[PDB]
């Protein structure tokens, strides 16, 4: 149900753990850092012996160099320079690149020590699942899969339908909805979705909804009114009140609220927001941060200074009662963030610009 996490040494530098869900894999993405040394049982191709190779399962300690996550693949890609292994194979100094899959045991050693918030973060993962969202109108149909940690478009399609006067226009829209229902079922199945949010203007969405309910009767099927179909509709639906409630446990969705509020303040009460790594650290030190919205790519920036600033600021706001929310760059909200350097913050009180030093 969540990542088992057990601290091995008295110096609390070494932790054994086992991802048991993709959210656990995401938790590793936002937690692990370059310099961490991991230890897995992988395997590699060794030249034993004469002109021949054998694939040998072996345990290595790798100084992490690269941590990479792509949603809906169930894989955390990792890479680095091997710092220890069976000496009979001479792997030290050589790059190992593998993937941590769900269920893969791995031990990781952090020199600075594993903080207590970090350990808790790691174990937090409620294996919250997945949802699918579609939007349909007479022009377009689009379908997406949603998780806490990512969003992926699965279908984008003009309904190259006749104009309304056309004879058997009724038949062609009937085929259209059938197509849309069949896709919504296929992906909800493929992704183990309990919930299917079906959006759009007017009755098309409910024609579609009825048919997918009938094919997956245990599925939770919610219609949402929305200005249009297609991808823009899926994105609008993420902002409607009903969906924000149903999907409230998803970061991608919760981000939308704090971005809406952030923009409101940009317009109406400017000194109560901050953005940019540097500014957010500044106001996080004051104790001014109520919540911080942060794209995960900042956690893994190639600039050491900004990784340290961001992790610090985040350590700070957590310690003084604040909420921290990490989202993928690959999300509607995460794309709005890039203009603000990838982090925004809602402040508890007005901090003047002259004071953010």
């Amino acid at each position: 149900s969540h990542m088992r996490v057990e601290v091995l040494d008295n110096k609390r530098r070494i932790v054994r753990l086992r991802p048991e869900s993709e959210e656990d894999l995401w938790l590793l993405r936002i937690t692990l850092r370059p310099g961490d040394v991991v230890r897995i049982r992988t395997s590699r191709d060794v030249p034993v012996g004469s002109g021949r190779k054998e694939r040998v399962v072996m345990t290595l300690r790798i100084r992490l160099d690269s941590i990479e996550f792509q949603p809906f693949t169930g894989k955390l890609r990792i890479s680095g320079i091997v710092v220890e292994g069976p000496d009979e194979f001479g792997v030290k100094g050589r790059r190992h690149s593998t993937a941590v899959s769900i269920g893969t045991w791995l031990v990781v050693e952090r020199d600075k020590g594993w903080s207590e918030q970090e350990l808790e973060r790691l174990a937090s993962g409620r294996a919250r699942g997945t949802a699918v969202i579609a939007a349909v109108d007479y022009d377009e149909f689009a379908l997406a899969v949603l998780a806490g940690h990512g969003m992926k478009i699965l279908e984008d399609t003009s309904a190259r339908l006749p104009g309304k006067d056309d004879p058997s226009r009724e038949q062609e829209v009937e085929k259209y909805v059938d197509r849309a229902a069949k896709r919504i079922v296929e992906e909800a199945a493929r992704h183990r979705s309990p919930i299917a949010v079906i959006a759009g203007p007017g009755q098309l969405k409910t024609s579609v909804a009825e048919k997918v309910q009938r094919a997956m009767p245990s599925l939770k099927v919610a219609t949402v009114d929305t200005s249009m179909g297609g991808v823009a509709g899926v994105r609008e639906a993420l902002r409607r009140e009903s969906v924000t409630r149903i999907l409230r446990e998803l970061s991608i969705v919760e981000a939308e609220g704090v971005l809406e509020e952030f923009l409101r303040r940009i317009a109406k009460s400017r000194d109560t927001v901050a953005y940019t790594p540097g500014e957010v650290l500044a106001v996080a030190r004051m104790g001014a941060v109520d919540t911080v919205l942060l794209v995960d790519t900042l956690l893994h920036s190639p600039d050491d200074a900004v990784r340290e600033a961001v992790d610090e600021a985040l350590r700070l706001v957590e310690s003084m009662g604040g909420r921290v929310i990490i989202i993928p760059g690959d999300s509607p909200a995460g794309e709005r963030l890039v203009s603000f350097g990838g982090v925004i913050a809602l402040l508890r009180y007005p901090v003047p610009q002259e004071a953010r030093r």
């Binding site: 022009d139 104009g163 007017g202 249009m228 963030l337």
Partner: protein, 432 residues
């Protein structure tokens, strides 16, 4: 005998479809057995006062609702003119379709209800008398006839006091949009009864102004930009037996001839024009303002869609990789920033586009650059911004082909902004 396109606009249910339907019936364009069959059909199902509207509304969801969803096209003529009248949806969920109608139009009939509560709905901050007047303006319609309607309703009853009020309110707003309001008719009518459609209405002796048909003949037909490269935004695509696949659209610029080879942008598909039909009439060429179907050899219905634009291979429609625009923010609840992605409505197309730069805030009175790269924009700032369409989009500089270079910015069922395009960064032409 000159041709013009009429788009019928206004708030939801203020009577656009009955007004068009009845006008056609009176003018002699609908058979008795048909208007009566519809009367039976209507009454038979929920709807009842819809027999006139149902000679436009024919979609399944449309009849059940009973709402106009997508444009309807009909032909008729007056003494001076032959007309394509375009019946637009009023419901806010379908203003994208009203917009494609407005871009096609030479002139608009604004239908506004005088009924207590109704008129106020449509003229409210979020109502569609207001929205459609805005959109018509930004889409380049400068000839407008307003029909003040439902004059027979119990709560109006031909009252000149009411008429005068709605006109007052209407005129104020339209004047601020930039309309020379005194040069445009406000015709008290009953779409349902027929008051002031064709002949004078006994019930409203105080009017004396022109009837609807009269107002129609006072319209002056637009200019015909020949010697501009051919542009036909496609409104719909049909697979028709005897013809093949035929796009339908209004010729915006240039001239099309049977036998011409034509390219559809952005798909880059090419085909040869086999035929041209307008109002069921065979043409050998289509001039600007013509609203045509044209059969295209070598292209299939899955290759091209609404929002694509046809042109000669010679000089193909521009596909904007990026574009620059002078905009004005009508409404937005907070701050517009870089990254904001409204949907852009131009000619027959609607494509979301990411603001990738706010180059400048402009003085709202004299237009000088007042701030470069401002943090944000609000209603009602004027700015120069750069856009990046999220899918390929045909746009054209306003100074070159205006009808392909004026647009509304819409987000979240609201009209947020309007703009004209000042620069285009063309994508590389690909051809098939």
């Amino acid at each position: 005998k000159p041709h013009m396109n009429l788009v019928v606009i206004g708030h939801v249910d203020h009577g656009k479809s009955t007004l068009v339907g009845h006008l056609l019936y009176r003018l002699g364009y609908i058979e008795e057995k048909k208007l009566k069959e519809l009367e039976e059909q209507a009454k038979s199902r929920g709807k009842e006062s819809f027999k006139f509207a149902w000679i436009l509304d024919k979609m399944k969801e449309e009849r059940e609702r009973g709402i106009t969803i997508d444009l309807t096209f009909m032909k008729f003529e007056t003494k001076k003119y032959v007309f394509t009248i375009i019946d637009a949806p009023g419901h806010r969920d379908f203003v994208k379709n009203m917009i494609t109608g407005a871009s096609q139009a030479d002139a608009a009939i604004l239908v506004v209800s005088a009924r207590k509560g109704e008129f106020e709905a449509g003229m409210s901050t979020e109502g569609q008398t207001r929205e459609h007047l805005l959109l018509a303006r930004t889409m380049g319609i400068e000839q407008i006839i307003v029909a003040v309607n439902k004059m027979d309703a119990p709560d109006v009853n031909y009252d000149q006091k009411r008429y005068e009020f709605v006109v007052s309110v209407l005129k104020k707003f339209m004047k601020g949009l930039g309309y020379q309001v005194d040069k445009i008719p406000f015709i008290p009518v009953s779409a349902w009864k027929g008051d002031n459609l064709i002949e004078r209405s006994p019930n409203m002796p105080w009017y004396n102004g022109p009837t609807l048909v009269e107002a129609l003949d006072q319209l002056q037909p637009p200019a015909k930009p020949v010697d501009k490269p051919l542009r036909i935004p496609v409104q719909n695509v049909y697979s028709i037996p005897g013809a093949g696949t035929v796009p339908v659209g209004r010729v915006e610029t240039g001239v099309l001839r049977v036998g011409d080879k034509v390219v559809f942008m952005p798909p880059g598909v090419v085909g040869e024009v086999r035929s041209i039909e307008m109002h069921y009439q065979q043409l050998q060429q289509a001039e600007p303002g013509d609203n045509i179907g044209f059969a295209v050899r070598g292209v299939s219905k899955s290759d091209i869609k609404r929002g694509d634009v046809a042109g000669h291979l010679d000089k193909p429609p521009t596909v904007a990789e990026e574009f620059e625009a002078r905009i004005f923010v009508i409404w937005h609840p907070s701050a517009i920033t870089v990254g904001y992605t409204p949907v852009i409505h131009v000619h027959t197309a609607s494509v979301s586009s990411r603001i990738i730069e706010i180059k400048a805030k402009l003085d709202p009175k004299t237009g000088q650059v007042v701030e470069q790269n401002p943090q944000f924009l609000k209603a009602g700032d004027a700015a120069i911004v750069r856009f990046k369409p999220v899918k390929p989009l045909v746009v054209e500089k306003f100074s070159e082909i205006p009808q392909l270079g004026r647009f509304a910015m819409r987000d979240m069922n609201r009209t947020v902004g309007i703009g004209i395009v000042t620069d285009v960064k063309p994508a590389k032409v690909d051809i098939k």
